[PDB]
């Protein structure tokens, strides 16, 4: 076979340890999922700088006045969160983040709300977004991309074992920490799902075809998105690339993908099996589950346990000038935080 006796026995034992780990991880998750609120207030923090902005608010660097610790504070304008699925999704985000625990998932520290806004305060990751490093360097070498991909594979294996689908994988959502490892943030589209779910949501370049086609879909959409991420990391641009979303969607559904001439044959084989329109054939969705990915030739040099334990030397260590350094983030327009005299949307966000 491809493996000798010693190699196959070790791998089998390793897979059984994974099952042992995931069983314990689920027990700890469920305890927090059933018993999740209001762990601080706005005036406990000094606002420093806006680190990112999107439709419904911003992420800011803040400094905790009492302890001097720095945090990333996400601010959601309760009114701007007006759309039906915008609302449910915000409750998903907070409840998932307060219950998970994994070395590549950002840690939530406080959450609270006032008359105008919802707030989630999490660990500050000063190395910046993968997105900006990727655009600056152009593309990552295959060993470099592989190091990051392995972390996503393990993170999705963890999430999916808890019946969580992530649904918004992309470089914009992946922060680089001081050791060069990944921190997945932005759980705004994550959802606990026992079978299928139906919401049309995500980022166009990363949408699986079954989402675009309005099918009930499952966790396999995350393995498709992994294929898009690996391609983008190794090429510098995503596989389905056009100016307007409708053109992106047509390319996604076609069942066609072209690869740069510098892609290794091992990489193309992996990506063909991840970017597979047929769900009966997509890696991660077969009888052997995630092991079809972990045991792929392109990952043959990957020490899965060593990645999880953070024993592998990272390919890139971001520059850090000290606590509160924002040099690895882009600049954004600053807008003061105005809190209304009157509560908005009190009933909608009772559970937050």
């Amino acid at each position: 076979g491809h493996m000798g006796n010693a190699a196959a026995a070790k791998k089998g034992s390793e897979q059984e340890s994974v099952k042992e780990f995931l069983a314990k991880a689920k027990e700890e998750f469920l305890k927090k999922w059933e018993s999740p609120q209001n762990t601080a207030q706005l005036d406990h923090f000094d606002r420093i700088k806006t680190l990112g902005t999107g439709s419904f608010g911003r992420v800011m660097l803040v400094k905790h006045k009492e302890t001097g610790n720095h945090y990333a504070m996400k601010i959601l304008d309760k009114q701007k969160v007006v759309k039906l699925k915008q609302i449910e999704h915000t409750l998903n985000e907070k409840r998932i983040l307060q219950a998970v625990n994994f070395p590549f998932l950002v840690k939530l520290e406080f959450s609270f709300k006032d008359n105008s806004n919802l707030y989630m305060v999490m660990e500050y990751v000063p190395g910046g977004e993968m997105f900006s490093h990727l655009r600056r360097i152009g593309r990552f070498s295959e060993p470099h991309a592989r190091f990051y991909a392995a972390q996503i594979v393990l993170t999705f294996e963890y999430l999916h074992s808890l019946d969580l689908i992530y649904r918004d994988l992309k470089p914009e959502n992946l922060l680089i920490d001081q050791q060069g490892y990944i921190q997945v943030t932005d759980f705004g589209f994550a959802k606990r799902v026992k079978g299928r779910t139906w919401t049309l949501c995500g980022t166009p370049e990363y949408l699986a075809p079954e989402i675009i086609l309005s099918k009930g879909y499952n966790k396999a959409v995350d393995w498709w998105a992994l294929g898009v991420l690996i391609y983008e990391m190794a090429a510098g641009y995503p596989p389905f690339f056009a100016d307007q979303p409708i053109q992106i969607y047509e390319k996604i559904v076609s069942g066609k993908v072209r690869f740069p001439s510098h892609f290794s044959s091992d990489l193309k084989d992996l990506l063909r099996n991840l970017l597979q329109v047929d769900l009966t054939k997509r890696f991660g969705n077969l009888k052997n589950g995630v092991n079809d990915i972990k045991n792929h030739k392109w990952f043959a040099t990957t020490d899965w346990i060593a990645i999880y334990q953070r024993k592998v030397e990272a390919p890139f260590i971001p520059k850090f000038k000290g606590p509160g350094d924002t040099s690895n983030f882009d600049d954004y327009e600053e807008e003061e935080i105005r809190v209304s005299i009157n509560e908005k949307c009190g009933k909608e966000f009772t559970e937050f």
Binding site: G54, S55, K83, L84, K85, Q86, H89, F131, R135, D168, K170, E172, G188, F189, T199, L200, C201, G202, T203, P204, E205, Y237, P238, F241, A242, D243, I248
Partner: peptide, 13 residues
């Protein structure tokens, strides 16, 4: 030709 800047996710397409 495609989008090179940060990409916003859509909550309800």
């Amino acid at each position: 030709a495609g989008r090179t800047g940060r990409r916003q996710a859509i909550h309800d397409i």
